[PDB]
Amino acid sequence: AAQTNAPWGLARISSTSPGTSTYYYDESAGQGSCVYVIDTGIEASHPEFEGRAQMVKTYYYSSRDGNGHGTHCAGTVGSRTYGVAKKTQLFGVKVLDDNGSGQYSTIIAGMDFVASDKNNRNCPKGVVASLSLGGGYSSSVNSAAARLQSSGVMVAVAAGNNNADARNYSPASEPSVCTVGASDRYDRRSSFSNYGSVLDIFGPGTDILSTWIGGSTRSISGTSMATPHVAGLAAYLMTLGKTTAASACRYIADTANKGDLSNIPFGTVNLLAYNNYQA
Ligand SMILES: [Ca+2]
Ligand SMILES: [Ca+2]
Numbered sequence: 712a713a714q715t716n717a718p719w720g721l722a723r724i725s726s727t728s729p730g731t732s733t734y735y736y737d738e739s740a741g742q743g744s745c746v747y748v749i750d751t752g753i754e755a756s757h758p759e760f761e762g763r764a765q766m767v768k769t770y771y772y773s774s775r776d777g778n779g780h781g782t783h784c785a786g787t788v789g790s791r792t793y794g795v796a797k798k799t800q801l802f803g804v805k806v807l808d809d810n811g812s813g814q815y816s817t818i819i820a821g822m823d824f825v826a827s828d829k830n831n832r833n834c835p836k837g838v839v840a841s842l843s844l845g846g847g848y849s850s851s852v853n854s855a856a857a858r859l860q861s862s863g864v865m866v867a868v869a870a871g872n873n874n875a876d877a878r879n880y881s882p883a884s885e886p887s888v889c890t891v892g893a894s895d896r897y898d899r900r901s902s903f904s905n906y907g908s909v910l911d912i913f914g915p916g917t918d919i920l921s922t923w924i925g926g927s928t929r930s931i932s933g934t935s936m937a938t939p940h941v942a943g944l945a946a947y948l949m950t951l952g953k954t955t956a957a958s959a960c961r962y963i964a965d966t967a968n969k970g971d972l973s974n975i976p977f978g979t980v981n982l983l984a985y986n987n988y989q990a
Pocket of ligand 1: 727728968971
């Protein structure tokens with residue numbers, strides 16, 4: 712399948728070079744997989760989700776996304792026009808309030824919730840969790856991410872936007888999950904992207920067009936935007952049978968575009984998510 716005039720990020724993950732505008736992907740498109748978006752919520756009624764999204768848990772007064780961040784990330788995972796895995800099932804867990812903030816205790820509870828909840832869902836091709844959030848180092852937050860990964864969920868987390876070593880941020884610094892940095896359309900490390908040895912992979916993160924609340928769209932930037940590219944790619948590859956939840960991050964790194972990125976500090980991987988599609 713081919714989506715013409717795709718958002719640059721989708722085109723980038725199906726090409727060995729920057730500057731293309733078509734997203735090439737297998738028609739299976741993540742069908743039979745499930746992705747939990749742990750964030751500010753998801754506007755599930757947005758036409759772009761085609762009924763494939765639903766809220767399953769909130770830690771606040773409402774399950775509504777009053778911010779937009781979660782809806783944007785969800786859109787990059789699996790919306791029709793802006794998504795990597797266009798037929799995946801999306802589950803929203805609202806651990807962030809409508810200002811985009813959340814206590815570590817709530818974020819941890821949300822991770823433990825997903826580890827349990829997945830046992831009540833029909834996700835024959837596997838389960839992914841996308842965490843476009845983070846803050847200062849916390850061994851408790853790292854431990855929760857490790858548990859979620861251990862339980863059989865492919866965990867993808869944002870490296871953070873501090874232009875610093877991700878070792879001082881959580882859950883970015885948990886080695887057992889998939890830690891994602893951001894690149895721009897010219898294959899540069901995004902100027903805000905964290906780096907360091909704990910990074911596993913880079914994905915598109917600057918000027919990413921996706922769904923927004925009020926049935927709208929908008930373009931924003933961050934490692935929060937790169938993370939759902941990788942989460943969606945994992946769901947896509949699991950549906951194809953190429954990899955499993957335990958090994959998807961490694962498979963993605965193994966099959967990535969290597970050495971294409973500029974402004975990568977010594978000691979950080981130069982690996983850009985790539986779906987290796989061939990018609
Ligand atoms: Ca290349
Ligand atoms: Ca890792």
